[PDB]
Amino acid sequence: DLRIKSQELEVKNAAANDKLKKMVKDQQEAEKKKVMSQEIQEQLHKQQEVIADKQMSVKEDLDKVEPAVIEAQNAVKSIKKQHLVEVRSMANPPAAVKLALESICLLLGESTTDWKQIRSIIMRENFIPTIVNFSAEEISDAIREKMKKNYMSNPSYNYEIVNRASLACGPMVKWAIAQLNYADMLKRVEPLRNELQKLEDDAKDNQQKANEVEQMIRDLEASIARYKEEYAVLISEAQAIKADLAAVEAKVNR
Numbered sequence: 001d002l003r004i005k006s007q008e009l010e011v012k013n014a015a016a017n018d019k020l021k022k023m024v025k026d027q028q029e030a031e032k033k034k035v036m037s038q039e040i041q042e043q044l045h046k047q048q049e050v051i052a053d054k055q056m057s058v059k060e061d062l063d064k065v066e067p068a069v070i071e072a073q074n075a076v077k078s079i080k081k082q083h084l085v086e087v088r089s090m091a092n093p094p095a096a097v098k099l100a101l102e103s104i105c106l107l108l109g110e111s112t113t114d115w116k117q118i119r120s121i122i123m124r125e126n127f128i129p130t131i132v133n134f135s136a137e138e139i140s141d142a143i144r145e146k147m148k149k150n151y152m153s154n155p156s157y158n159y160e161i162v163n164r165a166s167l168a169c170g171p172m173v174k175w176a177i178a179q180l181n182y183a184d185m186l187k188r189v190e191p192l193r194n195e196l197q198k199l200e201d202d203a204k205d206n207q208q209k210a211n212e213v214e215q216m217i218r219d220l221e222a223s224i225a226r227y228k229e230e231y232a233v234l235i236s237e238a239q240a241i242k243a244d245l246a247a248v249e250a251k252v253n254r
Contacts, residue, residue, distance in 0.1 A: 002245070005241060008241070016234050019227055019230065023228065030217055030224065034217055040206060041210065044207065047203050051199050054199075058193065061192075064185070065178065065182045068174075069136070069182055076131050076172050077128060083168040087101075087123070087168045087169065088119070088123050095156060096156055096169070100162045100176075101118055101172075103151045103176045104131065104175075104176060107139060107143070107147065107179060108131070136180075137186065144180060144183050147180050152180070157173075158173070
C-alpha cells in the first residue's frame with residue numbers, strides 16, 4: 001500500500017496552507033501600508049501649497065520696502081565728511097534739521113528733545129555707523145506710531161525740505177522713512193514667518209513618516225517574495241508525487 005504518500009502530502013499541504021496564512025498576513029499588511037503612503041502624499045501635497053503662497057507673499061511684502069532701505073543705508077554711509085562738519089558746528093539749527101535728527105534719535109532709542117544733547121549725540125564718531133548697521137527688528141509698536149504721529153505726519157518733515165536746509169540730514173531722513181515702513185511691514189510678516197515655521201516643521205516630519213512607510217512597504221515585499229518562491233517550489237516538487245503515482249499505477253496495471 002501507499003500509506004506513506006498520504007501523510008507525506010498531509011504535512012506538505014498543511015505547511016503550504018500555513019505558509020499562505022503568513023504570506024497573506026503580510027500581503028495585506030503591505031496593502032494597508034500602501035494606503036497610508038498615498039494618504040500621506042496627499043496631505044503633504046496640500047500642505048506645500050499653503051507654504052508656497054505664504055512664502056512668496058512674504059517676499060512680495062518685503063520687496064516693496066527693502067530696496068528703499070538698502071539704498072538709504074548706502075546714502076547715509078557714503079556721505080561727505082564736510083557735510084558732517086556743518087551739522088556738528090550748527091550753533092543755531094533750522095527747524096527741519098532739528099526735526100530730522102530727533103527722528104533718528106528716536107529710532108535709535110536715545111530719544112531726546114534738546115539740541116545741545118542732540119548735538120552731543122549727533123556725532124560721536126559712531127553716529128553714522130550705528131545708523132547703517134541697524135536692523136529694523138528693534139523698533140517697537142509704540143516707537144513706530146509715535147514716529148508717525150509727530151514726525152512724518154508733519155508737513156515740514158520730508159526729504160526736499162530737510163535736504164534744502166542740510167545735505168547731511170538729507171539721507172538719514174529717507175532712512176527714517178524706509179526703516180519705519182519696514183517696521184510697518186514686519187507687523188504683517190512676523191505672523192507669516194511664524195506660521196510658516198509651524199508648517200515647514202510638520203512637512204519635514206510628514207516626509208520622514210512618508211519615507212518610513214515606503215521602506216516598510218518595501219521590506220514587506222522582500223519577505224513576501226521569499227514566501228512566494230518557497231511555496232512555489234513546495235507544490236512544484238509535490239505534484240511530482242502525482243506524476244510518480246500515476247506512472248507506477250499504470251505500470252502495475254499494465
